[PDB]
Design a protein around this ligand. Structure first.
Ligand SMILES: N[C@@H](Cc1c[nH]c2ccccc12)C(=O)O
Ligand code: MET
Length: 311
């Protein structure tokens, strides 16, 4: 069942700065077929595929997704699956929906119907993820997200009765907001959160934030990671849901040794708690792979996939 589907997610990586930008390449990463084999060879079982459908769908009903863009997603799904990787297909950035859930609902539900119907026959290694990091008006009223996610799950289930569906809390998938998350009585849900604490370290110099946190911040482990993951595990036990931590990572403007400390500490605690996970991200400013030199960033990769269990 769903506990085994979550265990099968295992270790994963996001293909970020790619299809979740305004278009593929705008944020620096075009997808390549060779990425799938590299990710497998590095020890990952899963691709998370952020996709920002809003830039590629009609604004007026029936909100049709551009066929050429859809075919690109088809290709990613098919190539990952054929090469033995799981793939998580989400709806990723969606400024309109976070700002105005009620107004944008119709278009978002049409997008999910299109995705669900198109991929209804994909195997169980293909997972759906309803909405990356709900924020905006969902932060003001978390019940708006509880209501909307139930509508979207109902849409998905019309064509995909048993597929694993990944659902997170508001606060940009903050684990503390699990407290307000409410889920339908559906036995094939995996709960997700993202982990970037402390933001002053993991997002130092991140220009896409306002305010932009200053750089020069170092990091070492205290108790915050253990405290956060224990909270999340108790929530998951009480509510009988498996956990997938779909993003964690530290931006390259922090010093490498601090980033390695943080990445290894997080990965270790996730696996101690039996959480599957996907690192943010493959090839860009948080990347473990440098496409310019075609080399892995060894210290970061080994913090994710250690050669010995206590390293
Ligand atoms: N320097 C690497 C990784 C990288 C750093 N910042 C990025 C921003 C976007 C894309 C890639 C990157 C590259 O150019 O590929
Ligand atoms: C805030 S930068 C890391 C990526 C971002 N959290 C996303 O979900 O795309």
């Amino acid at each position: 069942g769903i506990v085994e589907l979550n265990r099968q997610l295992g270790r994963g990586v996001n293909l970020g700065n790619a299809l979740e930008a305004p278009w593929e390449g705008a944020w620096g990463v075009r997808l390549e077929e060779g990425f799938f084999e590299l990710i497998r060879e590095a020890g990952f079982k899963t691709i998370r595929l952020p996709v920002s459908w809003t830039h590629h769908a009609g604004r007026a009903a029936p909100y049709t997704i551009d066929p050429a863009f859809f075919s690109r997603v088809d290709w990613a799904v098919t190539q990952a699956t054929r090469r033995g990787l799981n793939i998580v297909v989400n709806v990723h950035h969606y400024d309109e929906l976070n700002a105005n859930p009620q107004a944008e609902e119709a278009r978002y539900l049409s997008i999910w119907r299109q995705i669900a119907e198109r991929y209804r026959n994909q195997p169980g290694s293909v997972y759906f993820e309803l909405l990356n990091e709900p924020h905006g008006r969902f932060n003001d009223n978390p019940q708006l997200w509880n209501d909307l996610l139930a509508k979207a799950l109902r849409v998905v289930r019309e064509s995909n009765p048993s597929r694993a569906v990944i659902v997170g809390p508001v606060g940009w998938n903050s684990l503390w907001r699990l407290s307000e998350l409410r889920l339908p009585d559906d036995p094939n849900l995996i709960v997700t959160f993202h982990y970037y604490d402390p933001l002053e370290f993991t997002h130092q110099g991140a220009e896409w934030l306002n305010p932009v946190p200053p750089t020069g911040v170092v990091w070492h482990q205290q108790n915050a990671i253990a405290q956060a993951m224990e909270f999340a595990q108790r929530w998951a036990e009480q509510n009988r849901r498996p956990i997938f931590v779909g993003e964690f990572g530290a931006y390259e403007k922090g010093d490498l040794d601090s980033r390695v400390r943080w990445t290894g500490a997080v990965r270790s605690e996730l696996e101690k708690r039996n959480f599957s996970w996907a690192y943010w991200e493959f090839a860009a400013g948080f990347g473990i792979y440098d496409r310019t030199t075609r080399q892995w960033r060894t210290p970061l990769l080994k913090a994710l996939v250690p050669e010995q269990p206590k390293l």
